[PDB]
RNA sequence: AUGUGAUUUUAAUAGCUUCUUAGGA
RNA sequence: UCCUAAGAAGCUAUUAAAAUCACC
């Protein structure tokens, strides 16, 4: 252990060492030649011409700082900013048993995508003339903890077919999410060893035939590609990785995931450890509270979905207030104090979760739980807009994100709840029916006090205006109804689900006229 | 299990050079930006009196030349990746490299930049006398 | 001989420093 | 006041064994 490392550790079982030439370092020369730190050329001992030594690619240390070359590992204030590009990664290994002992070649790779890739055991065997990347003999790990790697060593694909089904899975997942990949690892010690095989870091490059960042390398034709143009490109160009065990975690993976989540399981399979490694790393960064400082790029419909939500929220709240005449209206989870319907008579008690960077409007601080506050708010109606409470009371206007809808916005997350990353990161919990045992669904309708001014005539009882009640429907409200329908359908497509109290009556809006 | 080959002084530059699309350029850029050369090269206690040539079967070292073992003056043999030479075979592995002692604190970075004169066996520009 | 590390101890071995005793200057 | 030999203590390093934690 005198200034040595486990990297490139010769794992052969030949008793002799190496010749003075054809030896990579000074520590690999045999004892017959090594004299006072300066090897001697004995003309008697000839050099080996036929030998194969399995070099162990274990213990890579990516702590380099070079000027043009980006760093692989990232800080968890730069990995929370790239959350669309998290792909968990866990690698199961097989130990070398015949003619080589001492290194774990990779057998089973697994990602957060859900794809297990078996590979043949393949290692870097250092022949006299080159480093012959080739199949070595291996045994699967010992014990009844690893018994599903007993059949896997008799199947799999070579590493020039498991290098192109990693740039066909990453490229199909992250085609539309992001333009980099952040490999969330549990213990980087073996994930780096298993990334020597399909990763080529290099200077920051730009895609061929295109203008996006270059994230896929092709060794056959020496070019680079972004995540769209990578058809046939085999080597992943600069990834970024992150180690979750270096966030102060003491214990196993299934004894650190199973404290936050009861949905995932079946550990020590690669696709179910790479899912837990990302589940634990989404929890430890996002489930605490939404961080309002970290903006996010605009993938698609971010401007339209949010403005449509504001439009429909301005409508449903004002409609329910003008229809049922609630004396006071509460508010929960509204970070700022921004009155949705400011032109109202109700007193807007901002029962926020926590005061956020301003007390100019005296937002109150209160946390909500069902068994605690089931009988605390009895007066009026409480607008739980985008709140995450376990169960809602019997008088509310709720808008909860239905976390079972999958899109390029709604990334998978912890405890079956998901991360809806739209101009901010919201880790909304699982959409269960038990939350809505005091509520009903909301009908679709449009209600306005704007006087009518003087194309297809549309007759729908859902629209609530004195013009559609008459014989002729004005063109001053048909486009309004169509815009509102477009906003509502875009909202429902986005994944929200509106809910309302039991006594909500759409005919109560009519007597207002 | 296994007989260790590397030192922790190398495990920053070797790892970074194991992953590289171009291994020579990445090592030159590591050398430029605050980088220590690859230590632990194999060195020959030669008679140090011999005619100078780049690549020989036995170390023939001039008075201005340190003769190293030819597997530790090749970055690709030293990072265990594939040589860019066609037929993928190393030319330096098996023969003894002669590095001029003025630039022999960093052997690996000499064989990347310099070349061997084909007609007189000397390091071109470092004693090749073809005027 | 059958996998990779990391941290503690417990043995020897080597080096340095401090203290005690003895010999010499 | 200095040099050498022995004993004790401390620090560091090398090998060996054991124990714990993570990876497999
Ligand atoms: Mg793992
Ligand atoms: Mg695992
Ligand atoms: Zn492209
Ligand atoms: Zn989970
Ligand atoms: Zn009208
Ligand atoms: Zn070589
Ligand atoms: Zn010449």
Author numbering:
A (entry chain B): 1 to 454, 465 to 523
B (entry chain A): 1 to 131
What does the paper say about this structure?
Nsp14 is a bifunctional enzyme that harbors both 3′-to-5′ ExoN and mRNA cap guanine-N7 methyltransferase (N7-MTase) activities. The N-terminal ExoN domain of nsp14 improves RNA synthesis fidelity by removing misincorporated nucleotides or nucleotide analogs from the nascent RNA, whereas the C-terminal N7-MTase domain is involved in the 5′ capping processes of the viral genomic and subgenomic mRNAs. The ExoN activity of nsp14 is stimulated by nsp10, which binds to the ExoN domain and helps stabilize the architecture of the ExoN active site. However, the efficacy of nucleotide analog inhibitors on coronavirus RdRp is compromised by the presence of the viral nsp14 exoribonuclease (ExoN), an RNA proofreader that is specific to coronaviruses and a few other closely related virus families of the Nidovirales order and crucial to maintain the integrity of their unusually large RNA genome.
To obtain a stable nsp10-nsp14-RNA complex, we substituted MgCl2 with CaCl2 in the reconstitution buffer or introduced an ExoN active-site mutation, E191A, to nsp14. (D) Cryo-EM map and atomic model of the monomeric form of the SARS-CoV-2 nsp10-nsp14-RNA complex. The ExoN active site, which is located in the nsp14 ExoN domain and supported by the N terminus of nsp10, binds the 3′ end of the RNA, separating it from the 5′ overhang. Most of the RNA helix remains freely accessible in the solvent-exposed space. The binding mode of nsp8 to the nsp10-nsp14-RNA complex suggests that nsp8 may help stabilize substrate binding for ExoN-mediated RNA cleavage. As a common component in both ExoN and RdRp complexes, nsp8 may play a role in RNA substrate transfer between the two enzymes.
